[PDB]
Enzyme design. Structure first.
Site, PDB file in Angstrom:
ATOM      1  N   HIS A 191       0.824  -1.211   0.000  1.00 53.32           N
ATOM      2  CA  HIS A 191       0.000   0.000   0.000  1.00 53.32           C
ATOM      3  C   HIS A 191       0.866   1.273   0.000  1.00 53.32           C
ATOM      4  O   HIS A 191       0.323   2.367  -0.030  1.00 53.32           O
ATOM      5  CB  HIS A 191      -0.980   0.022   1.180  1.00 53.32           C
ATOM      6  CG  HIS A 191      -2.121  -0.956   1.084  1.00 53.32           C
ATOM      7  ND1 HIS A 191      -3.451  -0.585   1.187  1.00 53.32           N
ATOM      8  CD2 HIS A 191      -2.111  -2.316   0.948  1.00 53.32           C
ATOM      9  CE1 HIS A 191      -4.209  -1.680   1.086  1.00 53.32           C
ATOM     10  NE2 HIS A 191      -3.422  -2.732   0.944  1.00 53.32           N
ATOM     11  N   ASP A 248      -6.424  14.570   0.765  1.00 51.62           N
ATOM     12  CA  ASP A 248      -5.269  13.713   1.063  1.00 51.62           C
ATOM     13  C   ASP A 248      -3.990  14.524   0.918  1.00 51.62           C
ATOM     14  O   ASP A 248      -4.025  15.722   0.625  1.00 51.62           O
ATOM     15  CB  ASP A 248      -5.281  12.541   0.115  1.00 51.62           C
ATOM     16  CG  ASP A 248      -4.521  11.287   0.547  1.00 51.62           C
ATOM     17  OD1 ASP A 248      -3.668  11.286   1.427  1.00 51.62           O
ATOM     18  OD2 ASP A 248      -4.835  10.221  -0.042  1.00 51.62           O
ATOM     19  N   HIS A 264      -8.352  10.953   3.480  1.00 48.40           N
ATOM     20  CA  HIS A 264      -7.527   9.757   3.384  1.00 48.40           C
ATOM     21  C   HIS A 264      -6.088  10.015   3.808  1.00 48.40           C
ATOM     22  O   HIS A 264      -5.215   9.149   3.580  1.00 48.40           O
ATOM     23  CB  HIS A 264      -7.594   9.283   1.937  1.00 48.40           C
ATOM     24  CG  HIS A 264      -6.961   7.987   1.557  1.00 48.40           C
ATOM     25  ND1 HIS A 264      -5.738   7.910   0.909  1.00 48.40           N
ATOM     26  CD2 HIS A 264      -7.417   6.699   1.698  1.00 48.40           C
ATOM     27  CE1 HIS A 264      -5.459   6.612   0.689  1.00 48.40           C
ATOM     28  NE2 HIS A 264      -6.459   5.868   1.158  1.00 48.40           N
ATOM     29  N   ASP A 311       3.844  -0.537   4.015  1.00 52.59           N
ATOM     30  CA  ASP A 311       3.604   0.923   3.987  1.00 52.59           C
ATOM     31  C   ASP A 311       4.937   1.635   4.223  1.00 52.59           C
ATOM     32  O   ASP A 311       5.951   1.019   4.549  1.00 52.59           O
ATOM     33  CB  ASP A 311       2.581   1.314   5.046  1.00 52.59           C
ATOM     34  CG  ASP A 311       1.147   1.099   4.555  1.00 52.59           C
ATOM     35  OD1 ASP A 311       0.792   1.585   3.445  1.00 52.59           O
ATOM     36  OD2 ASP A 311       0.363   0.469   5.296  1.00 52.59           O
TER      37      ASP A 311
END
EC number: 3.1.4.4
Length: 496
Positions: free
Chosen positions: A163, A195, A430, A455
């Site tokens: 991700h 975001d 987000h 991540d």
């Protein structure tokens, strides 16, 4: 000492993941936040950047984001290294990649390019289709590009796959954050997702290149397994597990005075433990995080998981380093259970400990009217949890509520006076953002809700930059979001 917050985070990461230092986490000096001369805060690649306007007419953030993607790629002389979450980039995100690659080829450069996506795990044509669409769009420019494209899954059962959202050029510049390259959610919409990414240059971009080498080493090692990897390359080219190490200087050049900790995680299915780690923290007092008894909880009940996911510990340590105030902006603090536990117990314990000591905490999450971009029904799922963890250290539920209402701001996001966008859709956010003391902040892909993924992000200690972050993002966010607060110490609101 000029860097008390990174000093504490770094001490924690060396205990948690000593064997991963340099590759999955790394402290560097001599970086720069890569803003323009005209508008120096525009290293802060927020989107859409249309504060105050429920029609989002003037999207100065989106425009800067796409321009900076194109600029950085067009400056490449050796490598372009991209990771994201599937689907593969489309719309104007794709257009920015194509324009940048055309520019670098037009300047006479021959590039190596990696594009890695995580996806849920059947003849899968998506990677080769993306490879061929990109090549067709590049035309003659493709002729001196050595390309690798892949989709990867590291654990089906833990929902683990990449991700991270990273764009590294020549090991020198890096753009990273929460923004997926999805035109429908971010761009061609009158309810764009809100975001943020950052742009830097310097040694910390090398840290990102080493993280990507770690992911591509696994990916190439597994490229013949369909349950794990679907891979496509240009011409006769092979998989490049170590493009960064092989093509860029081990020590990226210095560009500024900014200190940074790069930190990521390996999720589940790449490496099961850091065998050099001897760190064995205490388990937290019992909670109601695990909705179902048979779930294996990697976040709260798996020591070895932490040792290959230093990012969870890094974010908890960033919270513990705050002396005055903490601002958190997330899609969610809680996850949907099952199959994840609802919350990170140690994270909520760290937030509780700070509020019991009079440190202010702000949490802004995405409106539950989005639940996609929300995983809760009510803000009370966050305040109830904070209260219950506070009760353990303040002597009971009454004192817990007092501590919370004296030190908490808790709200859902808005970017204008309207409770929703003008088109009637709720605001979705987000970000994966944490800032403390108007000093040190995280921008990256790691969510604070339980999540067992690959991540990545940066922790930056720079009061100058943190003040820019306040003026350009956190202050406008609170200006409009405070209306929805259920708890707001600054206004004596205690609805919870």
């Amino acid at each position: 000492a000029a860097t008390p917050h990174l000093d504490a985070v770094e001490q924690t990461l060396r205990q948690v993941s000593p064997g991963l230092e340099g590759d999955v986490w790394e402290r560097t000096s001599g970086n720069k936040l890569d803003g323009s001369a005209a508008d120096p805060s525009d290293w802060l690649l927020q989107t859409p950047g249309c504060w105050g306007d429920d029609k989002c007419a003037d999207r100065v953030g989106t425009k800067r984001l796409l321009a900076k993607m194109t600029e950085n790629i067009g400056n490449a002389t050796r490598t372009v290294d991209i990771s994201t979450l599937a689907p593969f980039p489309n719309g104007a995100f794709q257009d920015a990649i194509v324009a940048g690659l055309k520019e670098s080829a037009a300047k006479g450069n021959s590039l190596k390019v990696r594009i890695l996506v995580g996806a849920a795990p059947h003849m899968n044509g998506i990677p080769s289709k993306y490879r061929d669409k990109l090549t067709a769009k590049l035309g003659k420019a493709a002729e001196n590009i050595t390309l690798n494209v892949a989709s990867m899954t590291t654990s089906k059962t833990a929902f683990s796959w990449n991700h991270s959202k990273i764009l590294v050029v020549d090991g020198q510049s890096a753009l990273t954050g929460g923004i997926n390259s999805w035109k429908d959610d971010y761009l061609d919409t009158t309810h764009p997702v809100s975001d943020v990414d950052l742009a830097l240059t310097g040694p910390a971009a090398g840290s990102a290149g080493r993280y990507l080498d770690t992911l591509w080493t696994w990916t190439c090692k597994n490229k013949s397994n369909i349950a794990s990897v679907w891979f496509a390359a240009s011409g006769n080219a092979g998989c490049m597990p170590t493009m960064h190490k092989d093509t860029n200087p081990k020590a990226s050049p210095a560009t500024g005075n900014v200190p940074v900790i790069a930190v990521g995680g390996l999720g589940v299915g790449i490496k099961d433990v850091d065998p050099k780690s001897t760190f064995r923290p205490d388990l937290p007092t019992a909670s109601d995080t695990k909705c179902v008894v048979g779930l294996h909880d990697n976040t709260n009940a798996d020591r070895d998981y932490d040792t290959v996911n230093p990012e969870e510990s890094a974010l908890r340590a960033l919270v513990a380093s705050a002396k005055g105030h903490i601002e958190i902006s997330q899609q969610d603090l809680n996850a949907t259970c099952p199959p994840l536990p609802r919350y990170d117990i140690r994270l909520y314990d760290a937030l509780a400990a700070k509020m019991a000591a009079g440190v202010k905490v702000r949490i802004v999450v995405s409106d539950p009217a989005n639940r996609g971009y929300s995983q809760i029904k009510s803000l009370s799922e966050i305040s109830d949890t904070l209260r219950n963890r506070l009760a353990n250290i303040t002597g009971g539920q009454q004192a817990a509520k007092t501590a919370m209402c004296s030190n908490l701001q808790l709200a859902t996001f808005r970017s204008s006076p309207n409770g929703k966008w003008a088109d009637g859709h709720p605001y979705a956010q987000h970000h994966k953002l944490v800032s403390v003391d108007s000093s040190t902040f995280y921008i990256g892909s790691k969510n604070l809700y339980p999540s067992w993924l690959q991540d990545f992000g940066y922790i930056v200690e720079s009061p100058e930059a943190a003040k820019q972050l306040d003026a350009k993002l956190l202050d406008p966010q609170w200006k409009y979001s405070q209306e929805t607060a259920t708890v707001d110490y600054a206004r004596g609101i205690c609805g919870a």
